[PDB]
């Protein structure tokens, strides 16, 4: 049966992967001990995708954890749900990277890649019919962005005819945290655009805007932000684990969103995100879901689609519904905003439905949209890269570890032609 192998790279990836395995455990009804305590019977008929069977009726997540320092493996062991994860699946190291793409990719991640490949190959060959892989990592860190692209390139060579997803954490302009994060990110997207099917851009200041304005919270800790991130990660694989009127997988969403292999960057969004007091006033109805889904306040990437235009749009719905609402509403928003849609292809929307809603919720929707406004993010980080590299900034940390300056030059050109062909379709 089709199964998903989960990858957790970096401290950011570990802290969002812990909350991801937190959420779908309650979706399938799994206690902190490891057993099953549920109410219905459909929660057990598709559980092999994320969970492997054990003795005594125990289920363990199908995930491996990758990081280079022991600082954050403790927090993913002493957390509330840290005792469900397998103790053998933790792959850590003596020496970290420390916000350095060069050390993470060539001299520190080259030794730990042998161990984690042995772990993931041992698990994946035990799968009956593996569907695909899923990676969570950040572009602003040494370990997630350094050897995370080394993990991508290695298993692409080893498993060609597969699918992989990534939930990449691109850096933010105003919530910038690393000084050398253009070096950590531009060198990563050069190795990311070649061998990735699906890419979700999750930006931190987008989550700060949603928690402050729409949800009206005062103290948005990272435990709150990862719940928003995990709402979409659980919201993309709903029809694979729960039956519905019109099922859709990652591959079915893949073939409808990418028209060309170099156009695979997307804009995740979650429709029900009303604040706690405003909940009693807002009716939960299909036009209310599709109105908030297309709002620019709900975008999880730091760009506005008004400045560009939508290329392809995916919609995944949750809950028992009548879809004569979801076809007339998506036709209405396609007809009204004619200037924001391309005209060289009609009927740009793929629609999917799922019967089972998330716990505590009646209705839900997930948005995956491809556009040209992603180039605004790419131009914003390329101009900081150009304004930094031309005076040989921070280069002794990079050119002294094996790699030459021609790798910087080709990362300039490959990113420049990528945004050039993004403009050609605009």
């Amino acid at each position: 049966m089709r199964e998903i192998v989960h990858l957790q790279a970096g401290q950011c990836g570990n802290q969002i992967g812990a909350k991801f395995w937190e959420v779908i455990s309650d979706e399938h009804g799994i206690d902190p001990t490891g057993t099953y305590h549920g109410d219905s019977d459909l929660q057990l008929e598709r559980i092999n995708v994320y969970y492997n069977e054990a003795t005594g009726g125990k289920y363990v997540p199908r995930a491996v954890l990758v990081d280079l320092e022991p600082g954050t493996m403790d927090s993913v062991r002493s957390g509330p749900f840290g005792q469900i994860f397998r103790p053998d699946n933790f792959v850590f190291g003596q020496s970290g990277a420390g916000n350095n793409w060069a050390k993470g990719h060539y001299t520190e991640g080259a030794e730990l890649v042998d161990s984690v490949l042995d772990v993931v190959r041992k698990e994946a060959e035990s799968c009956d019919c593996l569907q695909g892989f899923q990676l969570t990592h950040s572009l602003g860190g040494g370990t997630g962005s350094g050897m995370g692209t080394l993990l991508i390139s290695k298993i692409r060579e080893e498993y060609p005819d597969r699918i992989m997803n990534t939930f990449s954490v691109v850096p933010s302009p105003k919530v910038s945290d690393t000084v050398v994060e253009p070096y950590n990110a531009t060198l990563s997207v050069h190795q990311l655009v070649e061998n990735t099917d699906e890419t979700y851009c999750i930006d931190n200041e987008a989550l700060y805007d949603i928690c402050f304005r729409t949800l009206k919270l005062t103290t948005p800790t990272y435990g709150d932000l990862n719940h928003l991130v995990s709402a979409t990660m659980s919201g993309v694989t709903t029809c694979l684990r729960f039956p519905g009127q019109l099922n859709a997988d990652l591959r079915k969403l893949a073939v409808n969103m990418v028209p060309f292999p170099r156009l695979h960057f997307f804009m995740p969004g979650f429709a029900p995100l009303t604040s706690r007091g405003s909940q009693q006033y807002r009716a939960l109805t299909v036009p209310e879901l599709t109105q908030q889904m297309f709002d620019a306040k709900n975008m999880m990437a730091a760009c506005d689609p008004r400045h560009g235009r939508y290329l392809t749009v995916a919609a995944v719905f949750r809950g028992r519904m009548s879809m004569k609402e979801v076809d007339e509403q998506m036709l209405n928003v396609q007809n009204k905003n004619s200037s924001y849609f391309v005209e060289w292809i009609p009927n740009n929307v793929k629609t999917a439905v799922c019967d089972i809603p998330p716990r505590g919720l009646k209705m839900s929707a997930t948005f995956i949209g491809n556009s040209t406004a992603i180039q605004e993010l790419f131009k914003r980080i390329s101009e900081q890269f150009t304004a930094m590299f031309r005076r040989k900034a921070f280069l002794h940390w990079y050119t002294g570890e094996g790699m030459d300056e021609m790798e910087f030059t080709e990362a300039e050109s490959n990113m420049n032609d990528l945004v050039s062909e993004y403009q050609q379709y605009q």
Partner: protein, 99 residues
């Protein structure tokens, strides 16, 4: 199959309880005069089953799994207490609006 798993867990718990009996009796016999040297004995009985420093999983029976994946050294993970307040998941869900 479920019955066998419960039986094996019960046998392991009985063995650990017998060790606890012996250890408590030896410490009580040794601490008759002074308690100035019972620290290694207290540390040994408070080591926890298995080479682990994380909190015991009381619902699992006090298991302390070990984490040694570091090239050829294999040093265990350290332990640190957190000053951050604990959270309830139902409270977090209701705050974030999934209710």
């Amino acid at each position: 199959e479920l019955d066998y798993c419960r039986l094996t867990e019960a046998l392991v718990a009985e063995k650990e309880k017998e060790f606890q009996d012996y250890a408590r009796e030896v410490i009580e016999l040794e601490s008759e005069t002074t308690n100035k040297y019972i620290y290694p004995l207290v540390k040994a009985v408070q080591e926890g089953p298995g080479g682990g420093r994380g909190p015991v999983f009381v619902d699992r029976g006090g298991l302390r799994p070990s984490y040694q994946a570091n090239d050829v050294t294999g040093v265990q993970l350290p332990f640190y207490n957190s000053q951050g307040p604990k959270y309830n998941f139902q409270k977090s869900k209701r705050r974030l609006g999934f209710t």
